[PDB]
Design a protein around this ligand. Structure first.
Ligand code: FAD
Ligand code: FSA
Length: 431
């Protein structure tokens, strides 16, 4: 029974883990029976979700994407917990290249092909005037030859604030926590030597926690903690910030998120005048000698270099270049603004960019909830609902089949991106 079942959520201070703990409580699990184990207190300072903001938008790449997006949208708009953090300013993808404009048009046509009426809130913008109408901060000269795809249901999400909001509730309810070494997963605990039955976890300080079920929602670290058999390859993306005065920020108030696949994106200034800028590239790995559990020997694994643990890192010189190109493309009036709070943010890619959400094939009672593939902050409100369905043997096949255990299913180093990721050992300047 739910009220009598003990769950441990490893990575419970991050995106998928906090969502899961939330939905355990909403399903009627007893709060004191839920233990969140995260290296950092929620919201985890090293979580990919520990960010001023993130984009919410529709992206149909795999079978469950449409239902997941609609689910999330409903809750970002209507869930009392999450709705303060969704800013429905819309999103506009732009391009001025022949191939880029082709991609926009095809993406639009894919929305239409869903047959549910997405054309009502998503529009191709074929003229300069139409683009300026949605994004008045542009100049007419700047956008010569641009085409746009405007997604009206999109916007941005106050990410760290939303995870904090879950955390405050978990703590009010009396969820148990472990942080630091007493919150850092070392290995699963098993009833027998055959490791067919997981009964808990041990953390790096030696603390043992017993439970009926364990959820590994450790994001970019999951692949380092247990042997995922190269199903997940962890990668770093980059961002920088720029500071605008209130008068500079005024032109951007409630302006849509702007994205171009050849450059990256920026989000409107937050309440303190801060604009976050990202480039667009296939990410950086960080291979280092490492030892995951369930692996007989140390493998080469891409392991996050955590900014929270080493705030003196930034990002490579090549990233400074591409983030400045993005600023020149979108925000040329701010070309002289100083970049700051430069950082790397870690995700873990599967081969096909589907989640990896399933019971471990051998370790019964141990569940994976990872493979975020760099596009899952938007699922904060709803993904925990399906993790709980999975725990309970009620997960529908559209999700179950997409999220299944699948070693050897393709190359996660390239994933659905333009190229295999380069490694930080080959990129100077971040250290
Ligand atoms: C990097 C990034 C990602 C991103 C984005 C921009 C950047 C730069 N923009 C996005 C956007 O606009 N829209 C969107 O939907 N997603 C976007 N993303 C992706 C998003 O950040 C990630 O997909 C998502 O947040 C990942 O969720 P997940 O839960 O998988 O990962 P996490 O939040 O990092 O949580 C992992 C937690 O695990 C803890 N941890 C790590 N090691 C341990 C051990 N050993 N024991 C216990 N806990 C552990 C971490 O502390 C973390 O809290
Ligand atoms: O999933 C989305 O709607 C946008 S994710 C934004 C982003 O920075 O997330 C991290 C990486 O996946 C990047 O490729 C990507 O541009």
């Amino acid at each position: 029974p739910r009220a009598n079942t003990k769950i441990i959520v490893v990575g419970g201070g991050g995106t998928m883990g906090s969502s899961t703990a939330l939905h355990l409580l909403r399903a009627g699990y007893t709060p004191s029976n839920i233990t969140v184990l995260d290296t950092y207190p929620i919201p985890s300072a090293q979580s990919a979700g520990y960010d001023l903001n993130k984009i919410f938008g529709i992206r149909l790449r795999n079978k469950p994407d449409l239902q997941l997006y609609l689910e999330a949208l409903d809750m970002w708009k209507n869930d009392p917990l999450f709705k303060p953090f969704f800013h429905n300013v819309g999103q506009m993808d732009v391009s001025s290249t022949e191939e880029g404009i082709k991609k926009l048009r095809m993406r639009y046509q894919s929305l239409l092909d869903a047959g549910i009426g997405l054309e009502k809130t998503n529009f191709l913008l074929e003229s300069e005037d139409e683009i300026l109408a949605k994004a008045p901060h542009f100049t007419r000269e700047q956008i010569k030859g641009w085409k746009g795809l405007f997604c009206g249901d999109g916007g941005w999400l106050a990410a760290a604030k939303a995870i904090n909001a879950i955390g405050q509730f978990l703590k009010e309810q009396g969820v148990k926590f472990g942080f630091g070494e007493a919150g850092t997963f070392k290995k699963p605990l098993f009833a027998d030597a055959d490791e067919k039955t997981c009964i808990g976890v041990e953390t790096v300080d030696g603390t043992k926690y017993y439970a009926d079920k364990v959820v590994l929602a450790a994001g970019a670290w999951s692949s380092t903690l247990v042997d995922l058999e190269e199903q997940c390859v962890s990668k770093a993306w980059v961002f920088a910030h720029i500071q605008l005065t209130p008068a500079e920020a005024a032109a951007y108030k409630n302006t849509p998120v702007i994205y171009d696949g050849d450059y990256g994106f920026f989000i409107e200034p937050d309440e303190n005048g801060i604009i976050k800028v990202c480039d667009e590239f296939p990410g950086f790995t960080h291979f280092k000698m490492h030892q995951p559990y369930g692996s007989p020997v140390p493998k080469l694994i891409s392991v996050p270099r955590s900014h929270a643990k080493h705030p003196t890192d930034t990002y490579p010189h090549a990233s400074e270049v591409t983030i400045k190109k993005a600023i020149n493309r979108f925000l040329p009036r701010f070309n002289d603004k100083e970049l700051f709070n430069r950082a790397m943010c870690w995700c873990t890619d599967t081969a096909d960019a589907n989640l990896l959400v399933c019971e471990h094939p051998r370790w019964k009672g141990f569940y994976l909830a990872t493979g975020d593939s760099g596009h899952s902050f938007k699922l904060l409100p709803n993904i925990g609902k399906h993790v709980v369905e999975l725990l309970e043997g009620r997960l529908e096949s559209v999700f179950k089949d997409a999220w299944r255990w699948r070693p050897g299913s393709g190359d996660a180093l390239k994933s659905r991106r333009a190229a295999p990721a380069k490694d930080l050992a080959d990129m100077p300047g971040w250290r």
